Amino acid sequence: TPPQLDPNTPSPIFAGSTGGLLRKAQVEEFYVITWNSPKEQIFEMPTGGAAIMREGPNLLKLARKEQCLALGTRLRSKYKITYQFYRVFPNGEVQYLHPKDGVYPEKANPGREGVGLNMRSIGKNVSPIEVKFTGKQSYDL
């Protein structure tokens, strides 16, 4: 699927907190989540406090992926809205992150490939003596 192309949409009504983007946004990547709220309502944002998300499109810039996905799961489970967040490096190159196929990762969409997948039971891994003095570990054959 094509990504959703993060626009300059508005943000929630928040009075400011001490949970924002300190330096991991200035020099490293920071994150941004966008959700379409059917109505204006209050929600507990993951950086501490309580914001009021607006009707229609909302946009909230967060410091790490766990904040974004925690807020997204609370949105999808409590307000039942469809979230999708990105990762914006300090030079640009906004990376589409969460669904990665349009459908949520709990659904087995075709096309996504098997990466990080061993075709063996967990106790058939060789011992560390087999992979000693080799850059590989006991779980990468």
Partner 1 sequence: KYGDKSVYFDLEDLGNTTGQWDVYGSDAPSPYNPLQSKFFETFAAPFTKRGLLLKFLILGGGSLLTYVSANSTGDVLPIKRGPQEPPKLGPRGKL
Partner 2 sequence: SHSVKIYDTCIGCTQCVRACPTDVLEMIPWDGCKAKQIASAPRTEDCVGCKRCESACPTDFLSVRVYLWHETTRSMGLAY
Partner 3 sequence: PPIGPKRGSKVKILRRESYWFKNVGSVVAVDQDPKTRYPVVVRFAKVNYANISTNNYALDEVEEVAA
Binding site for partner 2 (CB under 8 A): 19, 22-24, 28, 63-67, 69-70, 73, 97-98, 100, 105-110, 112-123, 137, 139-140
Does the protein bind partner 3 through residue 123 (CB under 8 A)? yes
Tell me the per-residue interface mask from 12 to 31 with partner 1, x by CB under 8 A, - otherwise.
-x------xxx--xx---x-
Tell me the per-residue interface mask from 32 to 51 with partner 1, x by CB under 8 A, - otherwise.
x-------------------
Residue 6 contacts residue 34 (beta carbons within 8 Å): yes
Residue 52 contacts residue 40 (beta carbons within 8 Å): yes
Residue 53 contacts residue 15 (beta carbons within 8 Å): no
Residue type, position 48, single letter: G
Q: For partner 2, which is the closer residue by CB, 6 or 54?
A: 6
Nearest in space to 96 (alpha carbons), one of 46, 47, 53, 32 = 32
